[PDB]
Amino acid sequence: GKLSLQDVAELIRARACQRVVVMVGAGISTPSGIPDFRSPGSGLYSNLQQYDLPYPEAIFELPFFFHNPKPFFTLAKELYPGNYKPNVTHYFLRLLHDKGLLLRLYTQNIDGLERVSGIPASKLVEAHGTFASATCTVCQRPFPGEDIRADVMADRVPRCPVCTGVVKPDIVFFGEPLPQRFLLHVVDFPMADLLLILGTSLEVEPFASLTEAVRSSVPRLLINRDLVGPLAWHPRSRDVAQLGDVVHGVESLVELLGWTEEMRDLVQRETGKL
Ligand SMILES: CCNC(=O)c1ccc(C(=O)NCCC2CCN(c3ncnc4cc(C(N)=O)sc34)CC2)s1
Numbered sequence: 559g560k561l562s563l564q565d566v567a568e569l570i571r572a573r574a575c576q577r578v579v580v581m582v583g584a585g586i587s588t589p590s591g592i593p594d595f596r597s598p599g600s601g602l603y604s605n606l607q608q609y610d611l612p613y614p615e616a617i618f619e620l621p622f623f624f625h626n627p628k629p630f631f632t633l634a635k636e637l638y639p640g641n642y643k644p645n646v647t648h649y650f651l652r653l654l655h656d657k658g659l660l661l662r663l664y665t666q667n668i669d670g671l672e673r674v675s676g677i678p679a680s681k682l683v684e685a686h687g688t689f690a691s692a693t694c695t696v697c698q699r700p701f702p703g704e705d706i707r708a709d710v711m712a713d714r715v716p717r718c719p720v721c722t723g724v725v726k727p728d729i730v731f732f733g734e735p736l737p738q739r740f741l742l743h744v745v746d747f748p749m750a751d752l753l754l755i756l757g758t759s760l761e762v763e764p765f766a767s768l769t770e771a772v773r774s775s776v777p778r779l780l781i782n783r784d785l786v787g788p789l790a791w792h793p794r795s796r797d798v799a800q801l802g803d804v805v806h807g808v809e810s811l812v813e814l815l816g817w818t819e820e821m822r823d824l825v826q827r828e829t830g831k832l
């Protein structure tokens with residue numbers, strides 16, 4: 559350091575960074591048409607009427623859900639795969655994976671767009687869960703998300719064929735532990751050679767501490783509206799910030815990498831398929 563974005567693009571082009579750990583949050587999917595839930599006016603938590611919620615947290619609370627699962631299932635029908643499309647940020651991470659450089663992608667999002675973009679499940683830590691599978695709330699039988707799709711789209715509350723309990727998509731609700739796959743962090747963070755943080759400032763724990771868990775010389779590259787959170791509170795000499803609009807930050811890195819044409823082709827193939 560002091561490193562630039564171009565310096566990092568060169569280390570990626572040289573394949574000196576081949577165990578990239580990526581952490582992403584809400585800021586990467588606003589260009590797909592999903593506002594952060596906290597956005598005034600447009601965000602889930604400011605639209606209690608269209609979900610029929612009595613206060614915003616209730617949508618991810620287990621006792622409310624048991625009392626009335628319909629608000630959560632309205633969200634599930636909106637966020638279920640096929641409604642929103644990944645954007646260039648997600649396709650960039652797909653390209654990182656197709657090139658052999660992605661160790662893990664840790665996502666705070668529940669929109670499932672990393673998996674839609676074609677990154678395999680084994681590369682993802684969906685830290686707040688996923689619509690891609692569901693579990694009986696009573697007997698714990700697992701179901702593929704496709705298996706409750708028809709119910710979700712027809713506004714029926716899916717039921718378990720063994721015990722008749724309600725079947726809930728595998729979103730982690732308030733107060734529940736993170737998914738067991740979260741503890742891959744123990745193995746992945748000491749091993750990362752490049753930490754890439756997109757569309758989140760990682761203020762909330764246990765994510766916040768993870769930013770310090772990479773080794774001393776690992777570059778940490780933040781592509782985010784602003785430099786806040788733990789990278790700001792405790793800067794390291796190989797940190798890079800690319801601020802402002804995350805799509806422009808990522809298009810800029812894609813060009814420095816020489817992947818712009820390869821990105822255009824990938825986005826054409828995929829949005830074809832969708
Ligand atoms: C420490 C043990 N458990 C925990 O720390 C937690 C368990 C459950 C937690 C929780 O917040 N559950 C609700 C799901 C979250 C998903 C991400 N989230 C978001 N907030 C704001 N905007 C967005 C946008 C999202 C998207 N685009 O998918 S997710 C999300 C907050 C609710 S936090």
Ligand SMILES: [Zn+2]
Pocket residue numbers: 694695696697698699718719720721722723
């Ligand atoms: Zn059951």
